[PDB]
Design an enzyme around this catalytic site. Structure first.
Site, PDB file in Angstrom:
ATOM      1  N   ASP A 171      40.999  38.465  47.596  1.00 50.97           N
ATOM      2  CA  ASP A 171      40.603  38.522  49.004  1.00 50.97           C
ATOM      3  C   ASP A 171      39.900  37.269  49.499  1.00 50.97           C
ATOM      4  OD1 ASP A 171      38.046  38.820  48.036  1.00 50.97           O
ATOM      5  OD2 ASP A 171      37.894  40.967  48.439  1.00 50.97           O
ATOM      6  N   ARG A 195      37.405  34.588  53.597  1.00 49.51           N
ATOM      7  CA  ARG A 195      37.298  35.942  53.062  1.00 49.51           C
ATOM      8  C   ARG A 195      38.062  36.851  54.007  1.00 49.51           C
ATOM      9  NH1 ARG A 195      37.077  40.680  51.809  1.00 49.51           N
ATOM     10  NH2 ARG A 195      35.490  41.645  50.431  1.00 49.51           N
ATOM     11  N   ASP A 234      38.666  44.972  50.510  1.00 49.97           N
ATOM     12  CA  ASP A 234      37.943  44.618  49.295  1.00 49.97           C
ATOM     13  C   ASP A 234      38.914  44.724  48.134  1.00 49.97           C
ATOM     14  OD1 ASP A 234      35.681  43.841  47.809  1.00 49.97           O
ATOM     15  OD2 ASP A 234      35.163  45.919  47.356  1.00 49.97           O
ATOM     16  N   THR A 235      39.227  43.602  47.506  1.00 50.05           N
ATOM     17  CA  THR A 235      39.967  43.623  46.247  1.00 50.05           C
ATOM     18  C   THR A 235      38.974  43.727  45.089  1.00 50.05           C
ATOM     19  OG1 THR A 235      40.099  41.191  46.370  1.00 50.05           O
ATOM     20  CG2 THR A 235      42.019  42.409  47.079  1.00 50.05           C
ATOM     21  N   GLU A 279      37.109  42.489  41.761  1.00 47.11           N
ATOM     22  CA  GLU A 279      36.862  41.184  41.160  1.00 47.11           C
ATOM     23  C   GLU A 279      37.857  40.921  40.036  1.00 47.11           C
ATOM     24  OE1 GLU A 279      34.563  39.117  42.723  1.00 47.11           O
ATOM     25  OE2 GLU A 279      34.279  40.791  44.112  1.00 47.11           O
ATOM     26  N   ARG A 323      31.734  31.533  54.432  1.00 48.48           N
ATOM     27  CA  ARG A 323      33.163  31.836  54.355  1.00 48.48           C
ATOM     28  C   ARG A 323      33.692  32.199  55.726  1.00 48.48           C
ATOM     29  NH1 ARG A 323      33.289  36.223  49.531  1.00 48.48           N
ATOM     30  NH2 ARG A 323      32.146  37.257  51.195  1.00 48.48           N
TER      31      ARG A 323
END
Ligand SMILES: Cc1cn([C@H]2C[C@H](OP(=O)(O)O)[C@@H](COP(=O)(O)O)O2)c(=O)[nH]c1=O
Ligand SMILES: [Ca+2]
Length: 129
Positions: free
Chosen positions: A15, A29, A34-35, A37, A75
């Site tokens: 992401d 971002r 939300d991917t 980690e 970001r």
């Protein structure tokens, strides 16, 4: 909202993607997702999915929402498109990201992404398997 040009510099993870935007390097971002980690389950698969999508694209674009354009880490916050296909939506539709981080006034594509997540869930894909 409107799409603006950018070029890929480097896919970082599921992401986050570094791009050149208005001639300056910036880490983006992806809004509303939300991917995992990289060190987490489905993290390497999410990273690979985003990387292939942005590296194969002939045309990358970014689309800012109505609200804040950068986060507290500097970001960029945007929807990213690869040959016209939204990366944010494609991750969610494949069960490689959850809809998340839905802040008021930067949520134009929320319902589009929730619909993708419902279909990923019904299909029991990836995160939902
Ligand atoms: C996606 C997104 C993240 N963030 C912040 C919230 C989280 O803060 P914290 O770092 O304090 O948890 C962090 C999540 O990003 P990551 O999922 O990339 O870690 O980035 C925003 O402020 N706005 C956004 O639209
Ligand atoms: Ca993440």
């Amino acid at each position: 909202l409107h799409k603006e040009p950018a070029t890929l510099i480097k896919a970082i993870d599921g992401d986050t993607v570094k791009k050149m935007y208005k001639g300056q390097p910036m880490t983006f971002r992806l809004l509303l997702v939300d991917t995992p980690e990289f060190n987490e389950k489905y993290g390497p698969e999410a990273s690979a999915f985003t990387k292939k999508m942005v590296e194969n694209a002939k045309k990358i674009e970014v689309e800012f929402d109505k609200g804040q354009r950068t986060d507290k880490y500097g970001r960029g916050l945007a929807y990213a498109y690869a040959d016209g296909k939204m990366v944010n939506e494609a991750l969610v539709r494949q069960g490689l990201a959850k809809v998340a981080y839905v802040y008021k006034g930067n949520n134009t594509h929320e319902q589009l992404l929730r619909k993708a997540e419902a279909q990923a869930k019904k299909e029991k894909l990836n995160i939902w398997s």
